[PDB]
Amino acid sequence: AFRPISVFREANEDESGFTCCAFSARERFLMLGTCTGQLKLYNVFSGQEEASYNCHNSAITHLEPSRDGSLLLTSATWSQPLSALWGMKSVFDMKHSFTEDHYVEFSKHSQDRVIGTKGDIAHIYDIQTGNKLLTLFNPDLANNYKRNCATFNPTDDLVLNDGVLWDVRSAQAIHKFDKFNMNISGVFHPNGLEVIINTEIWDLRTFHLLHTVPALDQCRVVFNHTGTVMYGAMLQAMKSPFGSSFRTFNATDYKPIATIDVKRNIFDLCTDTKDCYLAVIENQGSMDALNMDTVCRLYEV
Ligand SMILES: NC(=O)C[C@H](NC(=O)c1c[nH]c(/C=C/C(=O)N2CCCCC2)c1-c1ccc(Cl)cc1F)c1ccc(F)c(Cl)c1
């Protein structure tokens, strides 16, 4: 069971505007983005605010801390710039911005690059210089996914963009995965062997279809750090990205574990580095509430 541990809202706000979250390198502290563009650090057990930083002029949609704790990526809705990289050393400071990309991720093995997405286009940037190294787009192989997000594989050699597998070194598209849906572009399994594109699981060696998993339709997915569990939540067609439910799956065989309906719209979820806890941002009140008034709920896995 997910055992509820704590709940909290954004402090000194009439309406709570938490939108996204990620655990910090510090045990007990969660980073939360807000609908007015702030980044907050909270004690996840006591629900107390520790620090606040001004990041964007619009809602933070997504964020991602580097493992070493030194760097943070943020993305926003209708700001310019849409994404940015922040230093979390002495002074919280913007290192680089990514004017055109509405979503960004770090490289996975060595976190020296950022991959950004604009529509069906991937951009790869050097963290040090901020320089754009590669643009990845092939008009001949595009799938035109509506909710595309470009991503590196575990060893940083490959990129999946718009259902197309790219070799990063040669900057060549090596395979296009056929389109089976309008929206979801897919991710790499942390095992480095499989690609998960909506309901289709592809073998990365053969490009053969390994499994079909209907429950993953229209889902964003995230794995726990140890790569044993996969969380999925179905996108909706300051509105929540997701519905009221998320599902877990065994990462080794894609078998369903649990379906969790929180009966409230979900904005985000994340696990801690040790995969003990799950933090979920949920809107209070009722399904599809108009009022933006989110809480963070912490569960023990
Ligand atoms: N942090 C993570 O990576 C976890 C991940 N979060 C997001 O994917 C996410 C989390 N948030 C968003 C946007 C938020 C957004 O667009 N808005 C609209 C304006 C008001 C704020 C929310 C997204 C998101 C939506 C679409 C796209 Cl294609 C890209 C995305 F990143 C997740 C994985 C599995 C899950 F079960 C859950 Cl509940 C969450």
Of ligand 1's listed atoms, the one at least distance from the Cα of 242 is 38
- Four-residue CA torsion sign, 105, 107, 109, 110: negative
Dihedral angle over CA of 263, 234, 279, 152, nearest 10: 180
Find out whether the peptide bond into 4 is cis, omega within 30 degrees of 0. Answer: no
CB within 8 A of 45, min separation 6: which ones? 5, 6, 28, 298
Ligand 1 pocket list (CB less than 6 A): 19-20, 35, 59, 61-62, 77, 103, 147, 149, 220-222, 231-233, 235, 238, 241-242, 246, 266-270
Fold entry, domain 3-300 = Methylamine Dehydrogenase; Chain H (2.130.10)
Q: Is 215 helix (H, G, I), strand (E, B) or coil?
A: helix
Pairwise CA distance, residues 160 & 152, whole Å: 7
Instruction: Supply the DSSP symbol for 220.
Output: E
Q: Which of 123, 73, 67 is nearest to 94 (CA)?
A: 73
Q: Which amino acid is at 40?
A: K
Q: Which amino acid is at 120?
A: D
Q: Which of 92, 57, 40 is nearest to 281 (CA)?
A: 40
Q: Is 290 helix (H, G, I), strand (E, B) or coil?
A: coil
Resolution (A): 1.7
Q: Phi and psi of 74, rounded to 5°?
A: -125, 155
Q: Report CA 23 to chain centroid distance, whole Å.
A: 13
Pairwise CA distance, residues 28 & 152, whole Å: 29
Between CA 131 and CA 236, with CA 139 as vertex, the angle to 5 degrees is 85
Pairwise CA distance, residues 161 & 60, whole Å: 23
Structure tokens belonging to residue 49: 């605010």
Q: Which amino acid is at 140?
A: D
Q: Which of 243, 201, 235, 230 is nearest to 219 (CA)?
A: 235
User: How far is the centre of ligand 1, averaged over its atoms, from the C-alpha of 103 (Å)?
Assistant: 10
Q: Which residues of 156-185 are buried (b: 16+ CB within 10 A; e: fewer)?
A: bebbbbbbbbbebeeeebebbbebebeebb
End-to-end Cα separation, the chain, in angstroms = 7
Q: Kindly tell me the burial class for residue 294, based on how many C-beta atoms sit within 10 Å of its own C-beta (0-12, 13-18, 19 or more).
A: buried
Taking a C-beta distance cutoff of 8 angstroms, is the pair 293, 34 a contact? no
CB within 8 A of 121, min separation 6: which ones? 135, 136, 137, 161
